[PDB]
Design a protein around this ligand. Structure first.
Ligand code: HEM
Ligand SMILES: [Xe]
Ligand SMILES: [Xe]
Ligand SMILES: [Xe]
Ligand SMILES: [Xe]
Ligand SMILES: [Xe]
Ligand SMILES: [Xe]
Ligand SMILES: [Xe]
Length: 148
């Protein structure tokens, strides 16, 4: 597939510096949906402001975890059915921490933002479309974790 190749090529640029790129993704996310901030409760305390989250080692580790899951999705872009069961359980976990299924579309827009910013002129409409479809497949598998 040509879509598969657009994904693997663009991901190559981003995955050189995953924390730097993942920081962009979460900075964008909190700018779009500030009500996601209290869902990161480490030691039972809440971040007051989005900049607080950036000095938390646990929060930075969660950015690394995110980037690892995307990496696994890119690795298996040709056959995602093998990640399906892990992704369902990952959805169930996020339901438990208080994440609403609707928030995963803001996460989707934040990922596209971070790609657009990182790739500039190389972020073509074909590339955008490919990532959108892949993210779509990932969300579908995760959404099974929300009971339905
Ligand atoms: C709506 C945005 C999200 C919020 C508020 C959020 C919050 C959390 C919290 C509070 C935990 C448990 C504490 C921790 O491990 O840091 C967690 C676990 C995790 N999250 Fe996220 N998360 C979000 C989105 C994502 C996305 C999009 C991915 C991957 C694509 C992801 C991957 C993970 C992984 C891999 C774990 C560890 C799961 C386990 O094995 O227990 N999260 N999430
Ligand atoms: Xe952030
Ligand atoms: Xe931020
Ligand atoms: Xe971890
Ligand atoms: Xe990572
Ligand atoms: Xe990565
Ligand atoms: Xe993501
Ligand atoms: Xe993805």
């Amino acid at each position: 597939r040509p879509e598969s190749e657009l994904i693997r090529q663009s991901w190559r640029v981003v995955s050189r510096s995953p924390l730097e790129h993942g920081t962009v993704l979460f900075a964008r996310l909190f700018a779009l949906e500030p009500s996601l901030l209290p869902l990161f409760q480490y030691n039972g305390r809440q971040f007051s402001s989005p900049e607080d989250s950036l000095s938390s080692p646990e929060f930075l580790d969660h950015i690394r975890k995110v980037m690892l899951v995307i990496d696994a999705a890119v690795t298996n872009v040709e056959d995602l059915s093998s990640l399906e069961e892990y992704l369902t359980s990952l959805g169930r976990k996020h339901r438990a921490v208080g994440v609403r299924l609707s928030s995963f579309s803001t996460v989707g827009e934040s990922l596209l933002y971070m790609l657009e910013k990182s790739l500039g002129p190389d972020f073509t409409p074909a590339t955008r479309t490919a990532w959108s479809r892949l993210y779509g497949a990932v969300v579908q598998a995760m959404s099974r974790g929300w009971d339905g």
